[PDB]
Each structure stands twice: as structure tokens, then as C-alpha cells.
Design a protein around this ligand. Sequence first.
Ligand SMILES: *SCCCNC(=O)C[C@@H](CC(=O)NO)c1ccc(Cl)cc1Cl
Length: 423
Amino acid sequence: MQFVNKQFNYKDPVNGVDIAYIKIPNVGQMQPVKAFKIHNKIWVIPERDTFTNPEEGDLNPPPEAKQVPVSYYDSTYLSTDNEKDNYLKGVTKLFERIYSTDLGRMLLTSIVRGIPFWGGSTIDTELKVIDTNCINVIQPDGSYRSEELNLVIIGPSADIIQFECKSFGHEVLNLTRNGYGSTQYIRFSPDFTFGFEESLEVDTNPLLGAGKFATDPAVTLAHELIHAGHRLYGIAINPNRVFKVNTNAYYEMSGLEVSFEELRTFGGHDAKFIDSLQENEFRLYYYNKFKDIASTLNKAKSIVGTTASLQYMKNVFKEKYLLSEDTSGKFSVDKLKFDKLYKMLTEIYTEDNFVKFFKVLNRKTYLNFDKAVFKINIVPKVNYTIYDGFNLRNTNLAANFNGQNTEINNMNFTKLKNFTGLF
Ligand SMILES: *SCCCNC(=O)C[C@@H](CC(=O)NO)c1ccc(Cl)cc1Cl
């Protein structure tokens, strides 16, 4: 099957269902952006993210200076209708590449099922939505109807190559750390990709290599779906917990620290840097969060809104958290099923495992050094496909990851900025 049924053109007419101008809730004030609902609970906004953060409203560089050498600034990127057409087609292409594998089909199903928890009530007997987990669609009559959604694919802000997850917070709840979840905004662009070196000693060295191979953007997107996956199930490790990298003397020299959440998202040998004592403290911590989600679903006897039933919403949240619906009318947690789902989101959905499915050359660790960033156009099938990416089959590019070879497949890549030396 396809993940995206409709092949969207950016200049397609607005219908108010899956092609419409929309407003982001807690983005202070904004003018409407044309958005595309490519799947149930998944929208794509082909715009530079001048919205989610009040501090990121411009696309120019600030007084900021000698802090980020791994950065790239172009205020004209993603400003024309043609770029927006290729952006949304590039995101759509990468989403089918992720859907093309069993691992991606499982992560995408886990993402679509991960409805953010209805925990905005202040009465225990009432199940109410959290109002910033929605969007405001303009419908054909001209008015605004709010609609729940899980995932948003947004363009980057001023710093083009700094992809990251974003989500609005509560005044009290920590939505990505309390099992609730929250609508995730992924700053992403399919028009750029990073370089990396094939030898480990070179890739982890901040002084060697120009970036001979390029990262498959399908891996980069899937990396971010994994973060949003944990964040949509409220099991994200607090970004204050970081690991003091003592396996890279260049890292030790600068005191560079790497978060537990990203080491987990990459997986491989990196996810073993979490020593088993705090790995178990997290599972026990989030086990309790799942259970008073079950206790809250037990306390509730009324439902706010008119969109759906109380019966339907309780079934949604014992489907998301895999709670046990016995016949006491009360919901429970099965530690075995909780571990089955907690391990799936954390260990099964990793950047390293997606590499095994794509049969793709990739960075062997997250504790490396970015080397270069290229300009790419993966829209034309002569350049990139759903099933192969850059290594087109029955062609000199299919062998030896030659499609990702920026020197052998040189017309698919144009280097824009070197990161070697600036470290
Ligand atoms: S959902 C959070 C995504 C986090 N982003 C990253 O970890 C780094 C990304 C791109 C970025 O934001 N800044 O460089 C990245 C960079 C290089 C490579 Cl080879 C892969 C990836 Cl995923």
C-alpha cells in the first residue's frame, strides 16, 4: 500500500479537508499557511518554521557567531511555489520509502496510533482534550474548525540544516515525559543532506575528510520520526540527562555532551552507553506514568466535546498504551505488554536498524563530526527512488553504495559548506 494516497501538487485548489490554509494554535499570531494532510493525523506544511518559537521569526543570522560551524543559512530557500512543490513531493517520497520497509510500516503505525492523551481536564471524572494538540483548518465556508493531529512536517527556520523536534508544552504537564504525548513538529527538509566519511577513524575525527558519502535523507527523516515517536508516547528521556562522551578524546577535550535520548534514537553500540541501572530507572519511571493514565481513564465518567464518544476515546487510549480492558470496567497495565511496547519504541525503532532495512551506507555512530552538507533534488526518479534511494538498480550506482558516493555520483550533489576545520 501507499502511505500517501493523493499525489499533491502545491498549486492544487484548497478544499478545507486535506488541502487548506491553517493556523498553528499557540503560535501567538500568524497568517494562514497552506497545509497538506498526507495521512490520517499527519500534515505537511511546506514553509520555513517562523511559527513554533517566538524567538525564531527571521531567516537571517543573528549576532551569533563562533558557536555553530555546522550550520547553513539561506533566506530564499523554500520561498517560491516551485520549491514548495518539490519540498512536499520530497517529503511524500521519503514517507513512502519509510513505508516501503517493515520497520517503517511499524513505526508509522505506532505514530498514527499515538494520539496525544486527553488530559486537559481538571475534574477527575471528565476526559478533556489538550487544546494545543490540534490545528485550525479553514473550511470552504470561511470559518475555522479545530482538528486533532499527531505529526507535522515543517520546513527549517533560519538555520536550514538544524532539523529538530518541536512541540508545545503545558503549564503543568511535561507532555513528552509523562506518557501523554503531544503533537510533534519536525523541522525537516528533503533538499539538503549531510556528508560522512566511510572510515570510522576519519568520521569521528574533526580534522579529516570532506564528506565522500552522503546521508540518505530517508534515514534522517526516520531518525526524527523515532524521536517524535517517543515524544508522542510521552517516554522521551529528559534532555538534561546526558552522557559524558569518554570514547572520543576530541569530545572530552571540548567537554561535548550527548543526550541519552539521541543515543537511544540512534541505537547500535551507542545505545549501550546508557548503563543498565538508569536504563531500568526510566522503564520503571514510565511504567508508573502509563498506569495512572489507566487510573485517569478509570476516574473519568464524562467526555467533553462532541467529536467522539467516551467509549471510543477510552478504546483509543487502551489501544495506544496497550492497556488491558477487562470487564471490571477498569483499565490495567500489563508489565509484559508495557515492556513489549516500550522496547518497540526504543530498541526496535532506531536509526541503526533503518540502515539495515534500506541497505544504505551511514554514519556508524552519533558521536562523530559532520563534514559537509550538499544540495540535492531527490524528486526526479532518475536521481532517487522509493525503493533504492540514490543507488538505482540495474545501473552503475546500485553497487557499493555508489549512489551515495558524492564523487562517483557527482551530478546528484553540490557541496555548499565544509564543516572540516571549523571545529
Ligand atoms: S527529531 C530531532 C532531530 C535531531 N537532529 C539531529 O540529531 C541532527 C540531524 C540534522 C540536524 O538537526 N543538525 O545537523 C543530522 C545531522 C547529520 C546527520 Cl549525518 C544525520 C542527522 Cl539525523
